Amino acid sequence: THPIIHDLENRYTSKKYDPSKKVSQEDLAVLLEALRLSASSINSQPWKFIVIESDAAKQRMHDSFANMHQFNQPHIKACSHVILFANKLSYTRDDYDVVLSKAVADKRITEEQKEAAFASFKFVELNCDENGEHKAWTKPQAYLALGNALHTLARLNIDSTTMEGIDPELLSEIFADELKGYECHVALAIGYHHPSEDYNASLPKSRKAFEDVITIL
Amino acid sequence: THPIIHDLENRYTSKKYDPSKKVSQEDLAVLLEALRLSASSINSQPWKFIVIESDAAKQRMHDSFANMHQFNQPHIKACSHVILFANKLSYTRDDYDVVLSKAVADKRITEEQKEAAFASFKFVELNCDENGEHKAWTKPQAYLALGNALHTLARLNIDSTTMEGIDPELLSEIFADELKGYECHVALAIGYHHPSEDYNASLPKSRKAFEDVITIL
Ligand SMILES: Cc1cc2nc3c(=O)[nH]c(=O)nc-3n(C[C@H](O)[C@H](O)[C@H](O)COP(=O)(O)O)c2cc1C
Ligand SMILES: Cc1cc2nc3c(=O)[nH]c(=O)nc-3n(C[C@H](O)[C@H](O)[C@H](O)COP(=O)(O)O)c2cc1C
């Protein structure tokens, strides 16, 4: 099988973790750098990836399922790490300056060009909310990073469970300081599936017919 | 360098294509199958990938820049193929029926189990607009597929240019029948970069400091 196809046909959404297996620090470092290298519109990188690693942090994450989507709750303590994909509520010229200043330091643009680079900020203004927020534009950028992570995990042979069945309001309460100025609509559990109890590990993957999703013109 | 990191450090946004080079049909088939295999919330797959391959289709795509974002226009005819990432405007039971029906055909689930499997639809209703549209939920799913595509292209060593600088309204007119019931906010040109005029090929990649985007708890 073609290496790319094999990876994508074999990755799947785990429904049960093995609590005695952890992701190595070597593999976690590759995953985190892969997230950091994700592309985004105008290199805005309007995101924050919060890694739930310690037992203390796992408890806080476990508690965020207090009143909602409790089918996802068992994974928190059983998996190795949980990663929260947060997207920025409002993206400002100051936030963009952080990006452009780093670009000047990394040698891709010069100081005079920096002011010239501020024209791309047009894209941010084109995506302003009725309330002055940009979440409808920043959230999709975080999902791009998520697509990148799922492909990355398939290559490392690490199991995972993407989760939209989370409580954004409660997470904003529990991780008050960390999520300040951001919102989180999706999380990702990673680890190793249970050798016998993960029923999804043996089910066939199902997707729509090629002609139903692809059109060649 | 670690294979995953090398791929992600070496992929970049091409700013000029070599018009004499095309993506092979074998590579294109891998890319399209990779898109089809993308994960999505509840396996909704609320997308359509429109591939602009023919000269006739390239002309139509070229014409969609008549009013705005002309800086992206030169790539259309110069690149090999352009792929439109379309997300569904409103997701219904009928739509989910196509997913569940294919699931049974794939032997992932049974006919009787199909009706029980319909209980995941809570997520769709959960994301329903006051206008009965789910575009704020479907668009992020398409961006996940895009993140998957960018990683896939890095592995195939094919150059690309993601584009949000497009005209969704004009695209809806030009590709009237193909985009009916969908909207398109992002496109992707693929091909091979110009050997000496793609300035971005020799510029360093720049991303925020690890500490600025990642928090370990
Ligand atoms: C954005 C998103 C949210 C999802 N949320 C959940 C969730 O809350 N819990 C869970 O068990 N699965 C969830 N999934 C898993 C999907 O059901 C799964 O990706 C889809 O059925 C395709 O199957 P595969 O992932 O096994 O290929 C989610 C996937 C995505 C990409
Ligand atoms: C959603 C999205 C939209 C983008 N739109 C454009 C575009 O319209 N034109 C273009 O030249 N570059 C565009 N880019 C390219 C980004 O500027 C680029 O991904 C970002 O600067 C990081 O650089 P790299 O892609 O070179 O790593 C876009 C990227 C993304 C992911």
Side-chain angles (χ1 to χ4, degrees), chain A residues 39-41 43, chain B residues 11 13 15 72 162-165 205 207:
Chain A
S40 60
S41 185
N43 203 22
Chain B
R11 64 145 295 288
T13 297
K15 300 293 177 175
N72 281 332
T162 307
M163 298 175 300
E164 260 181 6
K205 185 172 303 303
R207 290 298 190 275

Side-chain angles (χ1 to χ4, degrees), chain B residues 188-209:
Chain B
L188 178 68
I190 67 175
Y192 290 93
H193 79 268
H194 195 292
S196 68
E197 283 180 271
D198 183 2
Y199 73 79
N200 210 28
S202 48
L203 294 179
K205 185 172 303 303
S206 185
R207 290 298 190 275
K208 288 169 176 173

Side-chain angles (χ1 to χ4, degrees), chain A residues 11-13 15 71-72 143 161-165 205 207, chain B residues 39-43 141 144:
Chain A
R11 64 145 296 287
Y12 73 107
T13 295
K15 301 292 176 177
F71 69 113
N72 281 333
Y143 272 66
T161 308
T162 307
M163 298 174 302
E164 259 181 6
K205 184 173 303 305
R207 293 294 190 276
Chain B
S40 60
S41 183
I42 77 164
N43 205 21
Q141 312 301 313
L144 191 159

Side-chain angles (χ1 to χ4, degrees), chain A residues 127-171:
Chain A
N127 291 281
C128 217
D129 262 48
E130 62 271 76
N131 303 325
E133 303 174 298
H134 307 261
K135 60 183 183 174
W137 174 72
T138 61
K139 188 188 178 180
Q141 314 300 315
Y143 272 66
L144 190 161
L146 176 58
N148 185 33
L150 290 173
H151 197 131
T152 294
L153 292 161
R155 299 181 68 179
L156 288 171
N157 282 279
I158 292 170
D159 298 309
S160 59
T161 308
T162 307
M163 298 174 302
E164 259 181 6
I166 63 173
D167 190 329
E169 278 188 60
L170 196 49
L171 280 173

Side-chain angles (χ1 to χ4, degrees), chain B residues 123-164:
Chain B
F123 285 75
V124 176
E125 311 173 345
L126 193 80
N127 289 279
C128 185
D129 256 306
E130 74 254 30
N131 306 326
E133 280 184 323
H134 309 260
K135 61 182 184 174
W137 174 71
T138 62
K139 189 188 177 181
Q141 312 301 313
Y143 272 66
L144 191 159
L146 172 61
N148 186 32
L150 289 174
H151 198 132
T152 294
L153 289 162
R155 298 181 68 178
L156 288 173
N157 283 280
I158 290 168
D159 295 311
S160 60
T161 309
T162 307
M163 298 175 300
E164 260 181 6

Side-chain angles (χ1 to χ4, degrees), chain A residues 7 36-37 41 43 45 49 51 54 102 106 108 148 151 155 164 200 206-208 213 215 217, chain B residues 7 36 41 43 45 49 51 54 102 106 108 148 151 155 164 200 204 206-208 213 215 217:
Chain A
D7 286 351
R36 190 177 76 99
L37 295 172
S41 185
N43 203 22
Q45 310 163 71
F49 310 106
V51 190
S54 74
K102 176 70 150 63
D106 284 333
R108 48 181 294 114
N148 185 33
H151 197 131
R155 299 181 68 179
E164 259 181 6
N200 209 29
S206 179
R207 293 294 190 276
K208 287 168 178 176
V213 289
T215 296
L217 303 178
Chain B
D7 287 350
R36 190 178 76 98
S41 183
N43 205 21
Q45 309 164 69
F49 311 107
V51 188
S54 75
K102 182 53 158 67
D106 289 344
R108 180 178 168 69
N148 186 32
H151 198 132
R155 298 181 68 178
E164 260 181 6
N200 210 28
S206 185
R207 290 298 190 275
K208 288 169 176 173
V213 290
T215 295
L217 303 176

